[PDB]
Amino acid sequence: GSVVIVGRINLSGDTAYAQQTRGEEGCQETSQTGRDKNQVEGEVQIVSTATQTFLATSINGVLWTVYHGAGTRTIASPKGPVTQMYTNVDKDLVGWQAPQGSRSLTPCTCGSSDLYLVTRHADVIPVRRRGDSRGSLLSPRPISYLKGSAGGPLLCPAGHAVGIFKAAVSTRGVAKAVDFIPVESLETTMRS
Ligand SMILES: CC[C@@H]1C[C@]1(NC(=O)[C@@H]1C[C@@H]2CN1C(=O)[C@H](C(C)(C)C)NC(=O)OCC(C)(C)CCCCc1cccc3c1CN(C3)C(=O)O2)C(=O)NS(=O)(=O)C1CC1
Ligand SMILES: [Zn+2]
């Protein structure tokens, strides 16, 4: 089965919003065939397999997401199923060549420690960077609130890509910190 784009998180306006482009029946069918003729736009896609739904984010012309969501699956596209360009299970990372029509987030060079995590419901959650791949949640959210947002972007105050959300440190169902694949690690994967 292919990963299928079923919506987007629009970030170009004053407030973020989620848009649905495909339902359950459409997603199941598109997954089997791997032929998706829908127009792609924006930076953050909402994606699904048959069993899970999550996010994918374009950075440096590659559409990235989490391995624990996508496995080694192809992504459905206009020309049929497209094989993964990158697969790094140790980083919980996969990527495909960004679909035609998509736009990529610019890598952050600010070195800012105030970050912003975008969820699949288009919430923008402030995150304080605490290391290479960690940020603490200033204001926590329960785990159920963040569920399905893996593969989404962490952004800097200027709206650059800082990383890809992959996991949350859960304490009794509440997330106090988030873990992410930094953009620099994405670049390293693209290099060597
Ligand atoms: C709920 C919002 C979370 C973002 C999110 N991710 C998850 O739910 C991932 C999936 C799974 C568990 N997990 C966790 O976040 C767990 C948790 C909360 C369940 C308790 N936390 C944790 O382990 O902290 C420990 C920590 C050290 C921070 C992990 C670092 C990563 C270590 C690591 C390295 C290499 C490979 C792999 C891992 C972990 N890995 C494979 C893997 O499969 O993890 C999600 O929403 N997923 S989703 O619903 O969209 C799903 C459909 C895609
Ligand atoms: Zn920046």
Author numbering: 990 to 1181
Describing publication, verbatim:
The HCV NS3/4A protease – a chymotrypsin-like serine protease – is a prime therapeutic target that cleaves four known sites along the virally encoded polyprotein. The NS3/4A protease also hydrolyzes two human proteins, TRIF and MAVS, which are part of the innate immune system, thereby confounding the innate immune response to viral infection. In this study, we report that four chemically representative protease inhibitors – telaprevir, danoprevir, vaniprevir and MK-5172 – exhibit distinct susceptibilities to the protease variants R155K, A156T and D168A. To elucidate the underlying mechanism by which chemically diverse inhibitors bind to the wild-type protease and drug-resistant variants, crystal structures were determined for 16 inhibitor-protease complexes. These complexes include wild-type protease and resistant variants R155K, D168A and A156T each bound to telaprevir, danoprevir, vaniprevir and MK-5172, with resolutions ranging from 1.10–2.50 Å; S139A protease variants were used except for telaprevir, which requires covalent bond formation with the serine 139 for efficient binding.
Vaniprevir, with the P2 isoindoline moiety, bound in a conformation similar to danoprevir, making favorable cation-π stacking interactions with R155, despite the P2–P4 macrocycle. Relative to the wild type, R155K caused large reductions in potency for danoprevir and vaniprevir, but MK-5172 remained highly active (R155K IC50 = 0.55 nM). For both danoprevir and vaniprevir, the R155K mutation disrupted the favorable cation-π stacking interactions with the P2 isoindoline moieties, causing significant reductions in drug potencies. R155K and D168A mutations confer danoprevir and vaniprevir resistance by disrupting favorable cation-π stacking interactions with R155. In danoprevir, the P2 isoindoline moiety shifted in response to R155K and D168A mutations, making extensive interactions with the catalytic D81. For vaniprevir, the rigidity of the P2–P4 macrocycle prevented similar compensatory changes. The flexible P2 isoindoline moiety of danoprevir containing a P1–P3 macrocycle packs against the mutated surfaces of A156T and D168A variants, explaining its relatively higher activity against both protease variants. However, the isoindoline moiety in vaniprevir is constrained due to the P2–P4 macrocycle, resulting in significantly lower activity against all three variants. The resistance at R155K occurs due to reduced interactions in the S2 subsite.
